[PDB]
Amino acid sequence: MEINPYLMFLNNDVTSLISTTYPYTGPPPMSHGSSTKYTLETIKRTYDYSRTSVEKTSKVFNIPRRKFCNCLEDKDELVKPTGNVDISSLLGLAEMMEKRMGEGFFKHCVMEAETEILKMHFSRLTEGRQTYDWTSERNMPAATALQLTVDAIKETEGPFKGTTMLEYCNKMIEMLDWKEIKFKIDSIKHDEFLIRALTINTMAKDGERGKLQRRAIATPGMIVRPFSKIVETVAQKICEKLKESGLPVGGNEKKAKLKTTVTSLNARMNSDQFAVNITGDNSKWNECQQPEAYLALLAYITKDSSDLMKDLCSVAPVLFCNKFVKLGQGIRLSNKRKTKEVIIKAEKMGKYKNLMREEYKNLFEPLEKYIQKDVCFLPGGMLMGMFNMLSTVLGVSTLCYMDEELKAKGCFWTGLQSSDDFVLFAVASNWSNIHWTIRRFNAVCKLIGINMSLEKSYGSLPELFEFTSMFFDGEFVSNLAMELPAFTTAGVNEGVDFTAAMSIIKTNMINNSLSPSTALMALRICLQEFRATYRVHPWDSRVKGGRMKIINEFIKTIENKDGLLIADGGKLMNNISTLHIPEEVLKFEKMDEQYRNRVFNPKNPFAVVSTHSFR
């Protein structure tokens, strides 16, 4: 006998079993790193996707500045990626989108974003994935680097008493002009501090479903954080009104968008037209988005609004037009037998170029011009996982295009676009005009850097496609975005994690990523993960751990074993219909009054605020 766990694909569908093809969600044990070779390859491919050769020496650094925007050359072999943007077409597409949605559309959205920003407290910045300190020169949570920055301001030129986003931003601006700056002790001059502020660091973390292509996810510093948040807030207020924008949210709403799109399509065309779908996946979505075009576009948006927003929205873009990238750890030398090994940093690789291998040399000399100390002056591209909302706006602009050249032939298109993945729906009346329409779309996309892959985009008749792991079909829309918790990496308290995991399971059920039996199994697994993390077990179990010892003696004094907490030799009582309800609220009336009042004693040395927290 032989085995082939794919023959079940013959007499069955694919929308029901495709999920079995991918491993289960969780932390990738690959440990995808950001070494110097990978970073240098990234910078090289960035400069190349720019199809130009123009430059202009700067005045603040005495360094060339490849100006790859509106200067396309080298048209040959243009099916491969390009990054040179055209401002005329860009603004034209933006105007088309405005015309469709309405006149006071951008104005209304930017006004809403503004008013939203005004009442915001800078403290929000503490909510972030990770950052890069400009003083310790490392990666840390947001709160730490924020405290460092504020206390440095205190130590150098008195405290910052603004307590608001606008005062914070103006303080950052002012700091750009200080000649000397202090921090716990040492200080630095103007140029060094400027550089540090415009630095970026390559992070290895890439956790999600689909594809972990974020080997070198870029993490900026702290100076630019608030402006990035402002621009993203505006772009978000805009992306909500767009029908073909599945980025801001997913699941139920995403299916609503899917089915609305398909039904409107079917109801739009006539009996002679027949449509088709295509599943596309943009390649190099980070090495072809330039902040210069974003700057021009934000200008076009705020062109008619309060000058406050005009100046504010024009900050983060220029901060990204000039971005030094920290080259990773430098190469190493070694003798023939490898018994001895020297280690050198990045700043010194230009000092030993005669030793490095050819492949490593030819990949380093053309960039030696742009190196400053240990970093590389990347003037464009967009490496961070930032501006996803704004990039989505540009994609939606690409899809809302229509002219008379198509109308004359009786053809058109529409579709839906996430950050870097899309689905196209072409319409025509011939098995040839479809090709013409597709090529037209690819051309208009290449005009503004948004490219498309050829080895990862396929297509067929309207019934079948895919989008953000949601394999749509005539029915039986299948999702694959099943999330789950992880305690070991994020340990907080023995009274919060469980409620968070229950809420997560509830959400996953809403999004159709989980079904009743699957949800119950997932719950009984997450409970056990919780126990094993915090080293707690029931009373029935014959464990002998420290925490159990005392529980192994002070237990006979109680009868309401059901009312006990999981954190205290308890048993589970929540179920499908009791997820929104924390276990505490569900056992309150059942806990023996003694234990109850012994738990809810605000006169203790330390979601229902329990006496189970780990400050």
Partner 1 sequence: KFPIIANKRMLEEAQIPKEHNNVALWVLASASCINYWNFCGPCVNNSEVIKEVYKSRFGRLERRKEIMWKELRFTLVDPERMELIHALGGETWIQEANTAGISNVDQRKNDIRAVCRKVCLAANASIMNAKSKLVEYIKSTSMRIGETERKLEELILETDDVSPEVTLCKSALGGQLGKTLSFGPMLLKKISGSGVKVKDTVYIQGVRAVQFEYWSEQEEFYGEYKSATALFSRKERSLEWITIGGGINEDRKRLLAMCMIFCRDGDYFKDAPATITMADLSTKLGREIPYQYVMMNWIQKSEDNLEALLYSRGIVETNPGKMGSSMGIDGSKRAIKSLRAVTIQSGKIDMPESKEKIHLELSDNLEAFDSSGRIVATILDLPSDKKVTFQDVSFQHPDLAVLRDEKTAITKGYEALIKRLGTGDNDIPSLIAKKDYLSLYNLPEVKLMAPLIRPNRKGVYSRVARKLVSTQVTTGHYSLHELIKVLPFTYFAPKQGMFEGRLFFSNDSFVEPGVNNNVFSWSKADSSKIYCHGIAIRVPLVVGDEHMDTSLALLEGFSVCENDPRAPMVTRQDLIDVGFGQKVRLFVGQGSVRTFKRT
Partner 2 sequence: IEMKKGKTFLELRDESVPLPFQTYEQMKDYCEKFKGNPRELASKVSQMQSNIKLPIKHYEQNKFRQIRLPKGPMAPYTHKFLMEEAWMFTKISDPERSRAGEILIDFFKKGNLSAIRPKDKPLQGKYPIHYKNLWNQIKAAIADRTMVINENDHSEFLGGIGRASKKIPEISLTQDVITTEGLKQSENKLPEPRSFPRWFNAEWMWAIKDSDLTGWVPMAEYPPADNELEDYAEHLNKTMEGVLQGTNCAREMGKCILTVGALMTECRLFPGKIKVVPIYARSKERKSMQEGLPVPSEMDCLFGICVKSKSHLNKDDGMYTIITFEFSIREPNLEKHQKYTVFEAGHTTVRMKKGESVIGREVPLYLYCRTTALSKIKNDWLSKARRCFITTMDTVETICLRESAKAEENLVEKTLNEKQMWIGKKNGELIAQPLREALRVQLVQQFYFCIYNDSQLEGFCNEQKKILMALEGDKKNKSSFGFNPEGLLEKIEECLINNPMCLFMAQRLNELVIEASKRGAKFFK
- Contact predicate 512/254, CB 8 Å: no
Report what 30 binds from partner 1, partner 2, none; CB cut-off 5-8 Å by kind: partner 2
Q: Given the rule CB under 8 A, which of 172-180, 197-205, 312-320, 602-610 is the region that contacts partner 1?
A: 602-610
Asked if 93 contacts 108 with a C-beta cutoff of 8 angstroms, the reply is no
| Residue whose CB is less far from partner 2, 184 or 357 | 357
Neighbouring-strand partners of residue 558 = none
From the CB of 597, what's the least distance to partner 2, in Å? 26
Range in contact with partner 1 (rule: CB under 8 A) among 100-108, 221-229, 270-278, 325-333: 270-278
Site for partner 1 contains 599 (CB under 8 A): yes
Residue from the set 164, 273, 305, 518 that interacts with partner 1 by CB under 8 A: 273
Our finding on whether 475 is near partner 1 (CB under 8 A) is: yes
CB of 245 to partner 2, least distance (A): 23
- 572 touches partner 1 (CB under 8 A): no
Task: State the binding partner of 586 from partner 1, partner 2, none, CB within 5 to 8 A by kind.
Answer: partner 1
Question: Left, alpha or beta for 284 (phi > 0: left; psi -120 to 50: alpha)?
Answer: left
Specify the residue, 16 or 213, whose C-beta has the smaller distance to partner 1.
16
Measured between alpha carbons, how far is 41 from 583 in angstroms, rounded to an integer? Answer: 52
Helix ranges (H only) for 420-574 are 433-446, 497-510, 516-534, 546-551
- Judged on CB neighbours under 10 Å (0-12, 13-18, 19+), 45 is middle
Q: Which two tokens stand for residue 93?
A: 């597409």
Listed in sequence order, the DSSP H helices in 20-141 are 36-49, 87-101, 105-118
Residue 54 or 576 with smaller CB distance to partner 1: 576
**Residue 416 beta carbon to partner 2: minimum distance, rounded to whole angstroms:** 18
Alpha-carbon distance values, 176 to 135, 342, 375, 442 (Å): 15, 38, 20, 42
**Amino acid occupying residue 369:** K
HSE-up of residue 204 (Cα within 13 Å, Cβ side):
11
Q: How far is the CB of 584 from partner 1 (least distance, A)?
A: 8
Report CA-CA distances (Å) from 491 to 380, 509, 588, 599: 38, 24, 25, 21
Q: How far apart are CA 75 and CA 82, in angstroms?
A: 10
Q: Is 138 in the site for partner 1 (CB under 8 A)?
A: no
Report, in Å, the least distance between residue 136 CB and partner 2: 17
Contacts of 185-188 with CB under 8 Å at 24 or more apart are 185/155, 187/156
Q: Give the Å distances, CA to CA, from 189 to 135, 182, 576.
A: 13, 9, 60
Number of residues that bind partner 1 (CB under 8 A): 65
Q: Two tokens at 192? A: 């060094």
Segment 482 to 511, residues that bind partner 1, using CB under 8 A: 494, 506, 509-510
By CB under 8 A, what part of segment 9-38 binds partner 1?
11
Quick note: the x/- pattern for partner 1 over 390-429, rule CB under 8 A, is ---------------------------------------x
CB of 420 to partner 1, least distance (A): 28
CB of 36 to partner 2, least distance (A): 12
CB of 526 to partner 1, least distance (A): 16
* Least distance to partner 1, CB of residue 51, Å: 39
* Candidate residues 99, 435, 524, 549; the one interacting with partner 1 per rule CB under 8 A: 549
Nearer to partner 2 by Cβ, of 17 and 500: the residue is 17
Question: At 414, is the secondary structure helix, strand, or coil?
Answer: strand
Helix (H, G, I), strand (E, B) or coil at 14: coil
Kindly list the residues in this chain that would bind partner 1 in the complex (CB under 8 A).
11, 266, 270-274, 429, 431, 461-463, 474-475, 494, 506, 509-510, 512, 515-516, 534-535, 540-542, 546-547, 549-551, 553-555, 557, 567-568, 576-582, 585-586, 588, 594-606, 608, 611-612, 614-615
